[PDB]
């Protein structure tokens, strides 16, 4: 089961989505909410194995037709990607 | 040791590179030169683990000082790259 | 939508499955059926970006709660893992 | 050129290795001393693209025949893979 924080459901009140009491979850386009910290973890522990850049790890998720809509996506995955070291490593290769 | 072909030494000797009789090893450009299918094992394998790009592995590679002068590494990184299904994948993300 | 072979419903019969007419797609264990290729496809791509081993893949799977039944999942996963010859080579490692 | 701290140098003389005024560096094993912290930085990059096990590292290290003797290396690589959350994880999967 998801578990929401307070900022969660003040970006989801923001966001527009709606909580479905009997259901115990948010819903969104559709879709159950994962939480940001859930989808937060999720997307660290994706970059961590494969270190794709944003562009690329964003249409790899468009394109996986998820079952839940993940709140702070884009966000999060920004913030992931921009403060990986390995990948600032690797891209720091001018001569 | 290392162990050259044919095709090796044709390629070394339109290289300008030199055979160290006393040594057992071509060298070139003050280096041991790592033959072709050795340098292609050793890229294809590194591509496999990390899936880094053409441009980004040869920075990598560059910024390495390797100890040996990698036979065809541009040509063979290039083709591996190009061929690599995982990278085409990845990358066929495109609207 | 899916499209499955005449193998797909070999496996699919012999597993005792059964095809949603209206639905346009088989159903196994209450879930729409992954055919065995796309399954395939979906797994080798995942072994290339992280190379895992079979015992992780697997687990990690199951942990991942996939809207999908993944047509000869762990037989597909095993040839995957034990026919890479990255997966060799970072196993090799005997003195 | 390398640059080391105090503490490199305590491990060094404590490892019986010698300082080459004349060439800038400390040797060990015949070999020019990667420090501490280098040796760290160069390690903790390799796990974050590889995610290899100790056991793993160590070998493709051992086999990589470096040309630079790695201070603290196995005692700095247990501590990345001990200490590796994405690691944590897809080995957290028991039952
Ligand atoms: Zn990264
Ligand atoms: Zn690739
Ligand atoms: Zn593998
Ligand atoms: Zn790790």
Request: glycine share 2%; charged share 25%; net charge positive.
């Amino acid at each position: 089961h998801f578990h929401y924080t307070v900022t969660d459901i003040k970006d989801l009140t923001k966001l527009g989505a709606i909580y479905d009491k009997t259901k115990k979850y948010w819903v969104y386009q559709g879709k159950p909410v994962m939480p940001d910290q859930f989808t937060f973890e999720l997307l660290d522990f994706l970059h961590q194995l494969t270190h794709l850049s944003f562009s690329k790890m964003k249409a790899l998720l468009e394109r996986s037709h998820s079952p839940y809509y993940m709140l702070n996506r884009d966000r999060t995955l920004k913030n992931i990607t921009e403060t990986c070291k390995a990948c600032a490593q690797v891209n720091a290769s001018k001569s």
